[PDB]
Amino acid sequence: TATEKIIELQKFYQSTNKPIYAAHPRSKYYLIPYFGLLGVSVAATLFYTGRACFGIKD
Amino acid sequence: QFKTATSIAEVEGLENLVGPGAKTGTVPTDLEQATGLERYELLGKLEGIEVFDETPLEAVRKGTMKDPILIDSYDDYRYVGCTGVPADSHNIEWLKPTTEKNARCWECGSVYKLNFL
Amino acid sequence: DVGPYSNLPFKVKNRRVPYAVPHFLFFAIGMGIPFFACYVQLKRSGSI
Amino acid sequence: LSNATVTNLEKRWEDLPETDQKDIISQLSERQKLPWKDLTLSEKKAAWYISFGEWGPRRPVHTKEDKLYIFWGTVIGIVISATIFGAFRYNRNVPKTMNREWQAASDEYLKSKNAEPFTGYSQIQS
Amino acid sequence: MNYINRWLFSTNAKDIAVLYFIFALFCGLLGSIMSLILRLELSAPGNQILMGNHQLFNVVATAHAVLMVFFLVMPAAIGFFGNYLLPLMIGASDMSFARLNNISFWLLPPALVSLLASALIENGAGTGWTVYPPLAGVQSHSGPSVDLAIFALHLTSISSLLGAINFITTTLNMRTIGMTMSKLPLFVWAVVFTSILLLLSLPVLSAGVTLLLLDRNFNTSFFEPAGGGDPILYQHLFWFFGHPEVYILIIPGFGIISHIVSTYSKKPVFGAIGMVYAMGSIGFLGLLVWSHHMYTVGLDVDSRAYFTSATMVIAVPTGIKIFSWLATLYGGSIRYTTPMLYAFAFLFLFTVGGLSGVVLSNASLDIAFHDTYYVIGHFHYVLSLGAVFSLFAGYYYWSPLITGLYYNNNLANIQFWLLFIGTNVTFFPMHFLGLNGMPRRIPDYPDAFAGWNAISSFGSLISIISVILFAYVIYDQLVNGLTNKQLSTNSLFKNPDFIESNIIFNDNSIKSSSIDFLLTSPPLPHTFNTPAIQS
Amino acid sequence: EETYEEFSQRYEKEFDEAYDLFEVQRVLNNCFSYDIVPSPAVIGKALNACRRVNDYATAVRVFEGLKHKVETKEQYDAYLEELKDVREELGIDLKEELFP
Ligand code: HEA
Ligand code: HEA
Ligand SMILES: [Cu+2]
Numbered sequence A: 001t002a003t004e005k006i007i008e009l010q011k012f013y014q015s016t017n018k019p020i021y022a023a024h025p026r027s028k029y030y031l032i033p034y035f036g037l038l039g040v041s042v043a044a045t046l047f048y049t050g051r052a053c054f055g056i057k058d
Numbered sequence B: 001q002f003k004t005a006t007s008i009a010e011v012e013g014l015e016n017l018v019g020p021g022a023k024t025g026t027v028p029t030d031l032e033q034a035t036g037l038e039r040y041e042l043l044g045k046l047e048g049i050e051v052f053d054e055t056p057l058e059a060v061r062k063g064t065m066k067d068p069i070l071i072d073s074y075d076d077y078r079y080v081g082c083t084g085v086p087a088d089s090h091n092i093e094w095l096k097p098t099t100e101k102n103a104r105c106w107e108c109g110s111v112y113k114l115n116f117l
Numbered sequence C: 001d002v003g004p005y006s007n008l009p010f011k012v013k014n015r016r017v018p019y020a021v022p023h024f025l026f027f028a029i030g031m032g033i034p035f036f037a038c039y040v041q042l043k044r045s046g047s048i
Numbered sequence D: 001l002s003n004a005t006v007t008n009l010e011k012r013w014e015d016l017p018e019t020d021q022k023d024i025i026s027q028l029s030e031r032q033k034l035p036w037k038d039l040t041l042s043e044k045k046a047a048w049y050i051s052f053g054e055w056g057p058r059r060p061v062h063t064k065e066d067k068l069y070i071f072w073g074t075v076i077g078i079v080i081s082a083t084i085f086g087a088f089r090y091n092r093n094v095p096k097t098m099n100r101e102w103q104a105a106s107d108e109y110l111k112s113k114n115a116e117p118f119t120g121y122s123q124i125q126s
Numbered sequence E: 001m002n003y004i005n006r007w008l009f010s011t012n013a014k015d016i017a018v019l020y021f022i023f024a025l026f027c028g029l030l031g032s033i034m035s036l037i038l039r040l041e042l043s044a045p046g047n048q049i050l051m052g053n054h055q056l057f058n059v060v061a062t063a064h065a066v067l068m069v070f071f072l073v074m075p076a077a078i079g080f081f082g083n084y085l086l087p088l089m090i091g092a093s094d095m096s097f098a099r100l101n102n103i104s105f106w107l108l109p110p111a112l113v114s115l116l117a118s119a120l121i122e123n124g125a126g127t128g129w130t131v132y133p134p135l136a137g138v139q140s141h142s143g144p145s146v147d148l149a150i151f152a153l154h155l156t157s158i159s160s161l162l163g164a165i166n167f168i169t170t171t172l173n174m175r176t177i178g179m180t181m182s183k184l185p186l187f188v189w190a191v192v193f194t195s196i197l198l199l200l201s202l203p204v205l206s207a208g209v210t211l212l213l214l215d216r217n218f219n220t221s222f223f224e225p226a227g228g229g230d231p232i233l234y235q236h237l238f239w240f241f242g243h244p245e246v247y248i249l250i251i252p253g254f255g256i257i258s259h260i261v262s263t264y265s266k267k268p269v270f271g272a273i274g275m276v277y278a279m280g281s282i283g284f285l286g287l288l289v290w291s292h293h294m295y296t297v298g299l300d301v302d303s304r305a306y307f308t309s310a311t312m313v314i315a316v317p318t319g320i321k322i323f324s325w326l327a328t329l330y331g332g333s334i335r336y337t338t339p340m341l342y343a344f345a346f347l348f349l350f351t352v353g354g355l356s357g358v359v360l361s362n363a364s365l366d367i368a369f370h371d372t373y374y375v376i377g378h379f380h381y382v383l384s385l386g387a388v389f390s391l392f393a394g395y396y397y398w399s400p401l402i403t404g405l406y407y408n409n410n411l412a413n414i415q416f417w418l419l420f421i422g423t424n425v426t427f428f429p430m431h432f433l434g435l436n437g438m439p440r441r442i443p444d445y446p447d448a449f450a451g452w453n454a455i456s457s458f459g460s461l462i463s464i465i466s467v468i469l470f471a472y473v474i475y476d477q478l479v480n481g482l483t484n485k486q487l488s489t490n491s492l493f494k495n496p497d498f499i500e501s502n503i504i505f506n507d508n509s510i511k512s513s514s515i516d517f518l519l520t521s522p523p524l525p526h527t528f529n530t531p532a533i534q535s
Numbered sequence F: 001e002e003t004y005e006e007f008s009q010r011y012e013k014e015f016d017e018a019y020d021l022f023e024v025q026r027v028l029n030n031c032f033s034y035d036i037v038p039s040p041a042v043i044g045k046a047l048n049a050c051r052r053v054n055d056y057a058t059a060v061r062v063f064e065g066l067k068h069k070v071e072t073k074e075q076y077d078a079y080l081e082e083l084k085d086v087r088e089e090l091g092i093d094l095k096e097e098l099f100p
């Protein structure tokens, strides 16, 4: 209702049965791009550090 | 999530410590916004009750097997460190009293019994 | 389940492959990597 | 409290189970309440061996047959390294300067230009 | 999923120490094989194993320095013994910042990858451990090797800073009910005094390394003398980190020895307040001296006289600790178990390796010993025989309590004697080679330096056999370790006294001065529910 | 700071108030942990204390510790010619007469 949803979200984060970082119905929008792009950032620095040990440049 | 406490006589868990709400246009007070183990200290200190004790061991009287020093615990064991009856004579010796056996402190000799609350 | 084989990250008893192979391969890799590095940098610089 | 249960406990005490050990102690503790000079010699020996004796937690850390094991384990740790280091000693690259007929020509040059006057000069090590 | 949330996404402080131990074992194996590569080349005159390459000799020396200054001694002495034992000694449940403990662990496997990849993409990084400016520029090392090696000294710095702030913040406000900060054990004081130097030393190193990077790749000329800079500045900005660092490696060792001397000799430590004041004095006087590593660079004549005076003063607090250890071992009863063997071999060899430091402190005598193998023989008697011995003693002391599985005594004794003999054969003729005049960092030498180099190549093959026997000791500990407690009475923490009967001793077995040896031995995940009480 | 005539009164008072075997062995263990050897009066109290709690091996092990605390052999035999009516009344046998 009003801007004091503080007395409402404190009855939700308690008794949730899910972890804190994935409890709200908004954490999809933060957690899907971050873990999506992290698996590209790590998979690009393990291709350019093995291509470079063989002497190949760009 | 349930009925809110007013004193610590009506606190049967974390389900009684949410509280009322603040009003629109006011900097809220700690009695209007606190949930967990923070509000429990708050309801203790506005009466005079210290929830988290910081008082050390009894260093007045010794320990006989007939009349032992009673150490209070909510478990079956509690670690007790003896350092003397004038409180700094004995060195630091640690002991574990249990609900089936009493510790006896190999240097000075005090006996400790466990009181299960 | 607290007990003498509960705080370790690897399983030791009641295991399909016996523990000697994962214990030996750890030390084999640990004492075999810095010879591979010397082999690569020797072969990149002409000498055998 | 028979003689067979008490006599010669120095060779049987570590083999009895822990329910035949707590009966001998609880039968010598109602025999010590009697005034002494009424105890047999075997009970006096057993009461000393049960509490103050070389069984259980009063064993030594090192026995006589363990120091021999440590000594002959260190020797077969030194012999292996000598045989490994010998294999990297036959197969060496020996440069031309390490020969006796080359280290005797160096001594004449070090003798003409006076070098090491006080101690010694000698480049010969075969 | 329960594997991930408990050994990868962790909060418990005692479960990160075991991961630190597993990492430290690997990073101490790699450097030891790299040292065996070096010592098998410095055997007889000529070019033996590395065919003609004087690169891939300096790279091996650099990577053997870095993997055991930064990746073995610090993770063992901070992660395995500091994270595990300090909450149990002060009586806390966990650390104050647990996620910072997790990041302080997990910054190190990305630091190993960059260092191992600093030796495959190019000639390599043969700059030495001290990465001096005018050699490590873009005229000798032009490639991604030095850059990826000075990015492995940033992540370790961040990890050490985040661990030190956690250690200081925990011991201030997370103690039990009856402990002031004068009843603390000595190991907690050792961790506090190393954590203050970790705050006060690492910004200078980070600044100097970053300015070297900017000189290499953004053409800034801080340390190039064609634009108005001096290389000597970097030396200042290195060695202000360098001498705190070498006490960071040795202060957590000292306290460990104290516990063993307090335990297996059944006496309390002689003068504990003098010992904590001595550690404070050693920690403070390690920051006011840094220029005794640089006496030949061309300093003033009135500046050498200050740094000879301020260096020999550090002998006075260390003698208090040594003589107090002797006074503790004097009166009591001594039983020779495998921690006390390493304890006895530490009080003699630290003295021998430390008395050489007084000879090198003089500016007149440093003209004959600088960049010479006397320095190497000085600091190997203190690093390999002072810190690694303390680590082995700490492992053989605290491993039955942590793990719950005992070990064979005889094989541990054989390992100790092999380490002793081989390491005393290896580093003693380096003094003779130094006094005769052999310089440092040379693959090939004149033919006069041959004979002692034949003897110092023999002890390394003895020490590697001891490492393999240590591996078998760990394997015999993990398998059938429940049945290795009745073979010997070494498993007992304290012996029965003269008047204490065996029947009385079996009822009351453990007598201690800390909380450590009264726990159940697997330590519980949540070990304190109700608080501990001290009078 | 403690003198002989205060040591040999304080340990008599401590030995004349023990109630169990743990306490007798506790006071006996820290009596032989100073620079002063125990007096013949203190050891005479310790054997009566071992008699009240009814233990035999402790009354033998007291005389064995005197052989290690005392510097020479003549002083040990000077201790045994004055603690003789205590031994032959209670009945305590030494270790070298039992041969255990
Ligand atoms: C491992 C840690 C460590 C330790 C403990 C020390 C200990 C000391 N070090 Fe340091 N030092 C290093 C790390 C360490 N050092 C390293 C790694 C190097 C090599 C440099 C490199 O190349 O990067 C080095 C090299 C080094 C040098 C040579 C620098 C050069 O090559 O020119 C010097 C000289 O001033 C020095 C100083 C000292 C001194 C005076 C001590 C003293 O603290 C030693 C104190 C010990 C005692 C004195 C024993 C006490 C016994 C007593 C009973 C006291 C009796 C009193 C008297 C002797 C008067 N060290
Ligand atoms: C960290 C301290 C340390 C350690 C441990 C060692 C270990 C050894 N070092 Fe030293 N050494 C240095 C300090 C150290 N060194 C430094 C700083 C340099 C660089 C100098 C420079 O760059 O200018 C150097 C370089 C160096 C060189 C090259 C010198 C140069 O190129 O100018 C040599 C060659 O003789 C040598 C000798 C040895 C030998 C034979 C060992 C052997 O002892 C190796 C065998 C190792 C073991 C005996 C211990 C194994 C450890 C574990 C497996 C135990 C794990 C612990 C737990 C389980 C808790 N070292
Ligand atoms: Cu220094």
Ligand SMILES: [Zn+2]
Pocket (backbone or CB within 6 Å): B082, B083, B084, B090, B093, B105, B107, B108, B109, B110
């Ligand atoms: Zn006490």
